[PDB]
């Protein structure tokens, strides 16, 4: 995480304060620094903690500066700060676990220090079809509910219908169902012409987080 939360100029300035502006050791110093953090090069942290960690690294830089200004060897200074940061990292709050089988799960997002970028679970947007069997004249209810946490802001539910009795996730068979809004869709009453797949797209603003599918089997 050293490379992600400190810049090359900061690290060069630290090493110069250690050995000198244009010292021949100035190169070795560099490789003592980065190597000292080699173990933390592939850690994954809770995305929501990145700022915190970055701030901590800022503190670290200053702590090193003073250490260099007061003589002090870089050879011991860098492993020391590396272990301090290792403990800081171990005490950070964890992101939520990935929950199968589908969805963009923002509360599971993690920051990868190897590459310095964020990542959610590699799950499909489309969730498995849920079979819902009712009889003619009976009420049917589709709950657009996922098993992972959704953001609070800007969530909408868009419904679609693929008729003709198709059990399908293929979008080319669906038309929009503008009557339906919200997480709960009701067919009152269900009839044979409702046979088909109902889909609900959960969106944050305009980006989809999940697409659910309900195959309504209406029985005579
Ligand atoms: Br940050
Ligand atoms: Br020292
Ligand atoms: Br985590
Ligand atoms: Br939120
Ligand atoms: Br909505
Ligand atoms: Br089918
Ligand atoms: Br449409
Ligand atoms: Br409609
Ligand atoms: Br409702
Ligand atoms: Br979509």
Author numbering: 27 to 246
What's the paper's own text on this?
This structure is reminiscent of IZUMO1, another gamete fusion-associated protein, making SPACA6 and IZUMO1 founding members of a superfamily of fertilization-associated proteins, herein dubbed the IST superfamily.
We expressed the extracellular domain of human SPACA6 (residues 27–246) in Drosophila S2 cells and purified the protein using nickel-affinity, cation-exchange, and size-exclusion chromatographies. The SPACA6 ectodomain was crystallized using a random matrix microseeding approach, yielding a 2.2-Å resolution dataset. The SPACA6 ectodomain, with dimensions of 20 Å × 20 Å × 85 Å, is made up of seven helices and nine β-strands and adopts an elongated tertiary fold stabilized by six disulfide bonds. A small additional single-turn helix (Helix 1′) packs perpendicularly with the bundle, forming a triangular shape with Helices 1 and 2. In contrast, the helical bundle in SPACA6 has an approximately 10° lean in the opposite direction.
